[PDB]
């Protein structure tokens, strides 16, 4: 149940005070919680990041970060209707397609692309054929791992084709949802990292509140495809910046 006590608050405070002064982690500005679940969660790791909805703290607005958008084959429909809409006309730093993306960016161009952007968002029909195009730098770890979006609010039936349109209000709504919420990727073992909060865009009670939000959404029973994956007793929590130790919370 409820996880906000003096142990959690002291650990998170001491982590911020350590990362302000320590000359070994003055570049990574992030807090992750490591959930040590009881059992091994069974579902294998596809690289599709499911979305954990925070309830009362937008941790990122879609305009304070670089967004790369990856589209389908002809890309003219998505590029024009996204760039001359003025609901979405300034939201994407880049809009490209998979064919000319893998044509242009080969080798160290991918390292420059990694350092250039910080939100990779793909059309869901091309999201699966990305781990060869974007290489393994985007899939080792998870900080620039691409998100699925549906571009049209239209569903495919059998024996008939998806009519090719796109909806800029709908795609702004789901990028707003993506930047407003946090995310996780399931795996086989009992370790699971979830990003919660930033180093100066956030503070201790809101980081603690969204920590408890991710806990509730994860060990929930309903919301079962997207969130109900912790089937057993969640055993431990830790907080860490990417080069910082695992400050423990809630040892059950």
């Amino acid at each position: 149940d409820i996880i906000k006590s003096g142990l959690a608050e002291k650990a998170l405070k001491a982590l911020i005070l350590q990362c302000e002064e320590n000359p070994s982690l003055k570049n990574d500005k992030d807090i992750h919680i490591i959930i040590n679940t009881g059992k091994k969660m069974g579902i294998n790791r596809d690289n599709i990041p499911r979305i954990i909805p925070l309830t009362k703290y937008k941790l990122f607005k879609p305009r304070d970060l670089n967004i790369l958008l990856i589209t389908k084959d002809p890309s003219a429909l998505y590029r024009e209707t996204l760039t001359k809409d003025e609901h979405t006309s300034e939201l994407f730093k880049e809009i490209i397609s998979v064919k000319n993306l893998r044509r242009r960016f080969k080798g160290s161009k991918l390292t420059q692309l990694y350092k250039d952007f910080d939100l990779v968002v793909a059309d869901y029909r091309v999201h699966h054929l990305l781990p060869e195009v974007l290489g393994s730098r985007f899939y080792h770890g998870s900080k620039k791992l691409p998100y699925m979006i549906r571009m049209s609010k239209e569903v495919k039936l059998k024996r008939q084709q998806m009519v090719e349109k796109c909806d800029p209000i709908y795609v702004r709504a789901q990028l707003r949802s993506i930047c407003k919420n946090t995310s996780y990727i399931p795996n086989n073992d009992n370790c699971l990292s979830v990003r919660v909060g930033y180093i100066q865009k956030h503070s201790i009670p809101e980081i603690l509140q969204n920590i408890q939000d991710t806990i509730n959404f994860l060990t929930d029973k309903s919301k079962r495809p997207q969130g109900g994956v912790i089937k057993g007793g969640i055993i431990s929590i830790f907080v860490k910046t990417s080069n910082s130790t695992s400050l423990p919370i809630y040892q059950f």
Binding site: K10, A11, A14, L15, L17, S244, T245, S246, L247, P248
Partner: peptide
């Protein structure tokens, strides 16, 4: 100080094992 407490804790846990 709690930072150094817990990193010494995991260090001496591994040393004890």
């Amino acid at each position: 100080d709690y930072y150094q407490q817990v990193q010494r804790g995991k260090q001496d846990k591994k040393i004890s094992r």
